[PDB]
Chain A
Amino acid sequence: AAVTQSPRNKVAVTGGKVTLSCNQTNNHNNMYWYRQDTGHGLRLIHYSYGAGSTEKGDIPDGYKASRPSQENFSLILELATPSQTSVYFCASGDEGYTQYFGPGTRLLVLEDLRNVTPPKVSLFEPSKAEISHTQKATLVCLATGFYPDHVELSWWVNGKEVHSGVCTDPQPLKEQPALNDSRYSLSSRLRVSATFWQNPRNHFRCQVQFYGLSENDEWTQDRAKPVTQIVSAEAWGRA
């Protein structure tokens, strides 16, 4: 009873065509699209009772729906506007009453893309004082200079993601609050045992998935095109 959405996060300009996709393998006849905006509960946009059909929901305006097949339900915004900034959930069901929800797709629609900038990423290595005082070792990751704030920071140890012992700022901070389109910073921490950190065969890496332009978006400036990309920083444990 599983549902996937792509992409999971999108940055888009005003007037852009944006397509949000949903896929389900359960052979569920019925699919649904919703948006979630704080201070409101989920709201139904379009739904479908089967391939080749769609139906208006409560808030259809500005969205077209496409049901090409049993597996696929697509939300299409022909002329994206800032007001469609939101989190979009897809859902599926058989004849019964349960709807099984996708993981959600975050969308931000900007007036201009002129300020989109990927982050620089730095990894800071545990203090020898901390080690001797607590027998723990704390790494710090720093992501700076990015705009907009659509980033996923994750930690990997020996090529597998770790969640235990991790905490990341609920929200990025603005590097220059006095400014309109200010850039953002975000910090994160991974604490391990001193001996885990002391192990020279443990590769630690901080990873930040930034969401920006697409290879197809137009880019009129002299700097490198701020595409959706991963920037990351990395270190090996030591004795």
Chain B
Amino acid sequence: NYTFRCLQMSSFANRSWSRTDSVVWLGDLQTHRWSNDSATISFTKPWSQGKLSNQQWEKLQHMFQVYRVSFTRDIQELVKMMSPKEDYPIEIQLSAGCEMYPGNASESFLHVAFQGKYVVRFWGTSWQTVPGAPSWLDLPIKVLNADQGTSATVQMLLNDTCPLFVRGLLEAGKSDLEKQEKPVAWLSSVPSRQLVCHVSGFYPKPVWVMWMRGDQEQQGTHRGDFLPNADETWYLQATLDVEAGEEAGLACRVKHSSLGGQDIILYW
């Protein structure tokens, strides 16, 4: 049930200075990156071309080499259009791609944030402002929608190219997408008093961590957030309040796909 995400982040500091950087994710694995300094898009995975031929890829990259330069000048020209209404510094963020579902069905999106607020999306055959968006955007929208050729292409990329590509990505990357990596747990404590159960290096993300006295799951166990490691595995911790002296006989228990049913039991 994997989501393919292109994340464009563009900064516009003043009239002249601008940079645009993207990353691409399939699920929670990075497949591409494209740094403002690079003329071309980089693969972060051996399979990042999916099942596209070299022709199909070059053509796709070229589509984008031109979009990057063009997007930039268009935002600049729109700032000229609104001013002094709106002004630099400006941050535009794009989130685009498609979610793939059982078998054939899919759903594409293209969402735009301005100054970190979601305001615009491509939907159907045109750009439209979403709810809560400021009315002034109605001018940029009307101008963007005048560009018939940009619209036709965006429709083609959302409707056809994106799911086609992702269909092929999932095939090329099954091996990495389905990798199983065992977590490793350790315990530690701090004053307030508070026990910690560190679980690190597991993949994929779904995991279970509860403190326990025997077979008794503790009420107050607090799951922290999933933190990433640099080698594409996950880190999580779980904390539990205790009166000093009560540490005796407490276990951290970890369930996870990689372990094939041998839960990690760590006593204190």
Cβ A55 vs Cβ B80 within 8 A: yes
Interface status of A49 (Cβ within 8 A of chain B): yes
Shortest CB-to-CB span from B138 to chain A, Å, is 12
Cβ B146 vs Cβ A96 within 8 A: yes
Interface hits, A171-221 → B, CB 8 Å: none
Interface status of A95 (Cβ within 8 A of chain B): yes
Cβ B83 vs Cβ A53 within 8 A: yes
User: In the bound complex, how far is the Cα of B142 from the Cα of A179, in angstroms?
Assistant: 60
Which of chain A's residues have a CB closer than 8 A to the CB of B80?
A: 49, 53, 55
> Which bucket holds chain B's interface residue count?
under 10
Cβ B146 vs Cβ A95 within 8 A: yes
Interface status of B81 (Cβ within 8 A of chain A): yes
Which of chain B's residues have a CB closer than 8 A to the CB of A97?
A: 146
B156-175 interface code vs A (CB 8 A; 1 in, 0 out): 00000000000000000000
Cβ A49 vs Cβ B146 within 8 A: no
Number of interface residues of A (CB under 8 A): 7
Cβ B83 vs Cβ A95 within 8 A: no
Interface hits, B62-103 → A, CB 8 Å: 80-81, 83
Task: Choose one: A53, A55, A95; the contact of B143 (CB below 8 Å).
Answer: A95
Shortest CB-to-CB span from A24 to chain B, Å, is 18
User: In the bound complex, how far is the Cα of B81 from the Cα of A119, in angstroms?
Assistant: 48
User: In the bound complex, how far is the Cα of B149 from the Cα of A96, in angstroms?
Assistant: 12
Q: Which of A50, A53, A95 has most B Cβ within 10 Å?
A: A95
Interface hits, A55-99 → B, CB 8 Å: 55, 95-97
Which of chain B's residues have a CB closer than 8 A to the CB of A53?
A: 80, 83
Which of chain B's residues have a CB closer than 8 A to the CB of A55?
A: 80
User: In the bound complex, how far is the Cα of B83 from the Cα of A53, in angstroms?
Assistant: 8
User: In the bound complex, how far is the Cα of B83 from the Cα of A50, in angstroms?
Assistant: 10
User: In the bound complex, how far is the Cα of B81 from the Cα of A69, in angstroms?
Assistant: 15
User: In the bound complex, how far is the Cα of B142 from the Cα of A97, in angstroms?
Assistant: 13
User: In the bound complex, how far is the Cα of B81 from the Cα of A95, in angstroms?
Assistant: 11
Which of chain A's residues have a CB closer than 8 A to the CB of B142?
A: 95
User: In the bound complex, how far is the Cα of B83 from the Cα of A49, in angstroms?
Assistant: 10
User: In the bound complex, how far is the Cα of B146 from the Cα of A156, in angstroms?
Assistant: 46
User: In the bound complex, how far is the Cα of B142 from the Cα of A96, in angstroms?
Assistant: 10
Shortest CB-to-CB span from A31 to chain B, Å, is 13
Q: Which of A49, A50, A55 has most B Cβ within 10 Å?
A: A49
A109-141 interface code vs B (CB 8 A; 1 in, 0 out): 000000000000000000000000000000000
Give the 10 A-B CB pairs with smallest separation, nearest first. A95-B146, A49-B81, A95-B143, A96-B146, A55-B80, A95-B142, A49-B80, A53-B83, A97-B146, A53-B80
Instruction: Provide a sorted-by-A list of 11 A–B residue pairs whose CB atoms are within 8 angstroms.
Output: A49-B80, A49-B81, A50-B81, A53-B80, A53-B83, A55-B80, A95-B142, A95-B143, A95-B146, A96-B146, A97-B146
Given A53-B80, A53-B83, 4 extra CB contacts under 8 A: A50-B81, A95-B142, A95-B146, A96-B146
